[PDB]
Amino acid sequence: MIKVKSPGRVNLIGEHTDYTYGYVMPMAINLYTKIEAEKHGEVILYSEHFGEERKFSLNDLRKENSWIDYVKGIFWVLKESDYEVGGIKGRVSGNLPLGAGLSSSASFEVGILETLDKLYNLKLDSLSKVLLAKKAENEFVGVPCGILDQFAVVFGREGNVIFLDTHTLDYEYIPFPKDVSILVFYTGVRSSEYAERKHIAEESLKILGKGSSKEVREGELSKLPPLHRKFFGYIVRENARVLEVRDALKEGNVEEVGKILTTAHWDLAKNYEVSCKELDFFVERALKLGAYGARLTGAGFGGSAIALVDKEDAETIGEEILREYLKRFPWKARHFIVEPSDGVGI
Ligand SMILES: [Cl-]
């Protein structure tokens, strides 16, 4: 019987850039999907969140349109990748909130992959784990995501964020400030528009004759159609912001990092149009209460936002904003204080 702890993730900066092979800067967080399991003839898993057991024969990787599909996707990608693995029986638990936008799917998928890696001694290298999990999500589950989530869940390192060039996969660990906490605020609001943005961004690269947004300057944008231009302008500005945050962090200039995150949030909200009033409310209030900066994290249109705050004020700021928020919106919002953590493992 083995136990695996697979973290969730928070992207600090570099949103909606990975599908045009731009820069991203995520971190694994100390909220996890936990898996305790042993070998078995079939696949049997009890989910603490759903409070139910779901199982399938190894012979059955048919989609059932339930959380079990995430498990089937991993068995599918391993078979598709020429690996022979057997079943597992176990329990899935942990404190990573389901569907809050902290990558429940990648955390779970990578956790299952790690469980199989250890039980069956597959000796997978870290990059392979990322690629397999991404392929499972993309081709089996059917969600067209970038590499951001999977990379963070596997490569995270305690006390560090990951600067990643999604075109070359070159990365580097950047230290996160000592007494600065990441206040996570889940709006309570658990796709289509993501797909649209992705298609438009891909057409833009082809129009510009480029393979990555990194190779695009603001000047060239005039050659794109109005709508394409509006969206791609955000991507170009975002790539530049990731590099600026990288430099600022290397100097420990948290004040500058915060200002950049805030600028990025309003760019996403006004130009990329992927925010919502619930997220905007949190950002504005967090800033008035002292945050160095705040920004939605993840895809947008709900989910969670983050605020960079002094460690000593994290609880108070979260509590004050939550009380104000619950008087304004009907959702079951929650706040968490997270720190950059190690990737999937024990
Ligand atoms: Cl999620």
Curated annotation (Swiss-Prot):
<comment type="function">
    <text>Catalyzes the transfer of the gamma-phosphate of ATP to D-galactose to form alpha-D-galactose-1-phosphate (Gal-1-P).</text>
</comment>
<keyword id="KW-0067">ATP-binding</keyword>
<keyword id="KW-0808">Transferase</keyword>
<feature type="binding site">
    <location>
        <position position="105"/>
    </location>
    <ligand>
        <name>Mg(2+)</name>
    </ligand>
</feature>
<feature type="binding site">
    <location>
        <position position="47"/>
    </location>
    <ligand>
        <name>ATP</name>
    </ligand>
</feature>
<dbReference type="InterPro" id="IPR019539">
    <property type="entry name" value="GalKase_N"/>
</dbReference>
<feature type="binding site">
    <location>
        <position position="194"/>
    </location>
    <ligand>
        <name>substrate</name>
    </ligand>
</feature>
<keyword id="KW-0119">Carbohydrate metabolism</keyword>
<dbReference type="InterPro" id="IPR000705">
    <property type="entry name" value="Galactokinase"/>
</dbReference>
<keyword id="KW-0418">Kinase</keyword>
<feature type="binding site">
    <location>
        <position position="137"/>
    </location>
    <ligand>
        <name>Mg(2+)</name>
    </ligand>
</feature>
<dbReference type="GO" id="GO:0005829">
    <property type="term" value="C:cytosol"/>
</dbReference>
<feature type="site" description="Transition state stabilizer">
    <location>
        <position position="9"/>
    </location>
</feature>
<feature type="binding site">
    <location>
        <begin position="15"/>
        <end position="18"/>
    </location>
    <ligand>
        <name>substrate</name>
    </ligand>
</feature>
<dbReference type="InterPro" id="IPR022963">
    <property type="entry name" value="Galactokinase_bac"/>
</dbReference>
<comment type="similarity">
    <text>Belongs to the GHMP kinase family. GalK subfamily.</text>
</comment>
<keyword id="KW-0963">Cytoplasm</keyword>
<dbReference type="InterPro" id="IPR019741">
    <property type="entry name" value="Galactokinase_CS"/>
</dbReference>
<feature type="active site" description="Proton acceptor">
    <location>
        <position position="149"/>
    </location>
</feature>
<dbReference type="InterPro" id="IPR036554">
    <property type="entry name" value="GHMP_kinase_C_sf"/>
</dbReference>
<dbReference type="InterPro" id="IPR006206">
    <property type="entry name" value="Mevalonate/galactokinase"/>
</dbReference>
<dbReference type="InterPro" id="IPR013750">
    <property type="entry name" value="GHMP_kinase_C_dom"/>
</dbReference>
<keyword id="KW-0547">Nucleotide-binding</keyword>
<keyword id="KW-0299">Galactose metabolism</keyword>
<dbReference type="InterPro" id="IPR020568">
    <property type="entry name" value="Ribosomal_Su5_D2-typ_SF"/>
</dbReference>
<dbReference type="GO" id="GO:0004335">
    <property type="term" value="F:galactokinase activity"/>
</dbReference>
<comment type="pathway">
    <text>Carbohydrate metabolism; galactose metabolism.</text>
</comment>
<dbReference type="InterPro" id="IPR014721">
    <property type="entry name" value="Ribsml_uS5_D2-typ_fold_subgr"/>
</dbReference>
<protein>
    <recommendedName>
        <fullName>Galactokinase</fullName>
        <ecNumber>2.7.1.6</ecNumber>
    </recommendedName>
</protein>
<dbReference type="InterPro" id="IPR006203">
    <property type="entry name" value="GHMP_knse_ATP-bd_CS"/>
</dbReference>
<dbReference type="InterPro" id="IPR006204">
    <property type="entry name" value="GHMP_kinase_N_dom"/>
</dbReference>
<dbReference type="GO" id="GO:0006012">
    <property type="term" value="P:galactose metabolic process"/>
</dbReference>
<dbReference type="Pfam" id="PF00288">
    <property type="entry name" value="GHMP_kinases_N"/>
</dbReference>
<keyword id="KW-0479">Metal-binding</keyword>
<feature type="binding site">
    <location>
        <begin position="99"/>
        <end position="105"/>
    </location>
    <ligand>
        <name>ATP</name>
    </ligand>
</feature>
<keyword id="KW-0460">Magnesium</keyword>
<dbReference type="Pfam" id="PF10509">
    <property type="entry name" value="GalKase_gal_bdg"/>
</dbReference>
<dbReference type="GO" id="GO:0000287">
    <property type="term" value="F:magnesium ion binding"/>
</dbReference>
<dbReference type="Pfam" id="PF08544">
    <property type="entry name" value="GHMP_kinases_C"/>
</dbReference>
<dbReference type="GO" id="GO:0005524">
    <property type="term" value="F:ATP binding"/>
</dbReference>
